[PDB]
Amino acid sequence: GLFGAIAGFIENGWEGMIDGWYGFRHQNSEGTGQAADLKSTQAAIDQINGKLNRVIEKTNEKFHQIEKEFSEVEGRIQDLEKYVEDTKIDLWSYNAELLVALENQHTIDLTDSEMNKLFEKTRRQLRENAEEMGNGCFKIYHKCDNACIESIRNGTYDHDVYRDEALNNRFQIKG
Amino acid sequence: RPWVRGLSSRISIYWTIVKPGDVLVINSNGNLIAPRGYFKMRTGKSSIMRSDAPI
Numbered sequence A: 001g002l003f004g005a006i007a008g009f010i011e012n013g014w015e016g017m018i019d020g021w022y023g024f025r026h027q028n029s030e031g032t033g034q035a036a037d038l039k040s041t042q043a044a045i046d047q048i049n050g051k052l053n054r055v056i057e058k059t060n061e062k063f064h065q066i067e068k069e070f071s072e073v074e075g076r077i078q079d080l081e082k083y084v085e086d087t088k089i090d091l092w093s094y095n096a097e098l099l100v101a102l103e104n105q106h107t108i109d110l111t112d113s114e115m116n117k118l119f120e121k122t123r124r125q126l127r128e129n130a131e132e133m134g135n136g137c138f139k140i141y142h143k144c145d146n147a148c149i150e151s152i153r154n155g156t157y158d159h160d161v162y163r164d165e166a167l168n169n170r171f172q173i174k175g
Numbered sequence B: 001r002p003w004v005r006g007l008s009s010r011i012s013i014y015w016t017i018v019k020p021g022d023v024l025v026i027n028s029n030g031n032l033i034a035p036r037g038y039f040k041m042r043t044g045k046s047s048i049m050r051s052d053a054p055i
């Protein structure tokens, strides 16, 4: 969408991630692992639910109106009676069509935004300790066990603690 | 007129709403199908629907 993250720099999606909408996957010295991000997931869910409320269950209440089906040909009034209703239905059909279009464009660009936001949140936490591959992955230039990976996932990663190590590898010498 | 239920004559129905403080006066020297009273009128959420759906 507008943000170029989902169906853009992030190749495809994980049918495997079933505990969230957004999350992480990693590989360190000891192995691999994966875990869903709740925050971004709730932002997306929350916005879509808000949007869903405005649309859903908001019906008017109408009682006696005009007639809309006729047994005999009459002329001037029934023409008008039919034109009024027909006119009403087309303007309402335009209304529905446009709403779903604008709503859907919006939901897509929105969820795109939330992926990318996560990405920039993580990018900023990692400071000079990581470089971006460009497929949604950061190459962490220092040893990061699962606990280290988790500190990132829950935003408590302290980059000063791993700076010198990281810098060194990011800028090694041919020697 | 076309025979209906054996008759070829008809009745034409009419109505007259009488607002409070007003008064109704019927005058006729023939062919009247006189009223017997009045129906009370209400304004509410009612209406009618042509339908063959089972309630």
Ligand SMILES: *[C@@H]1O[C@H](CO)[C@@H](O[C@@H]2O[C@H](CO)[C@@H](O[C@@H]3O[C@H](CO)[C@@H](O)[C@H](O)[C@@H]3O)[C@H](O)[C@H]2NC(C)=O)[C@H](O)[C@H]1NC(C)=O
Residues within 6 Å of the ligand: B001, B002, B003, B008
């Ligand atoms: C004016 O013309 C109309 C139409 O020709 C006449 O109406 C007809 O009246 C007769 C009365 O004999 C009706 O007869 C009845 O028919 C029914 C159904 O067939 C039956 O139940 C009875 O046994 C009887 O024969 C006839 O149906 C009816 N036709 C129509 C269209 O209404 C009317 O009498 C004429 N008046 C004069 C002065 O010519």
Ligand SMILES: *[C@H]1O[C@H](CO)[C@@H](O)[C@H](O)[C@H]1NC(C)=O
Residues within 6 Å of the ligand: A150, A154
């Ligand atoms: C650190 O992140 C969240 C903050 O609420 C906490 O609930 C989570 O469980 C923490 N991670 C671990 C493994 O405790």
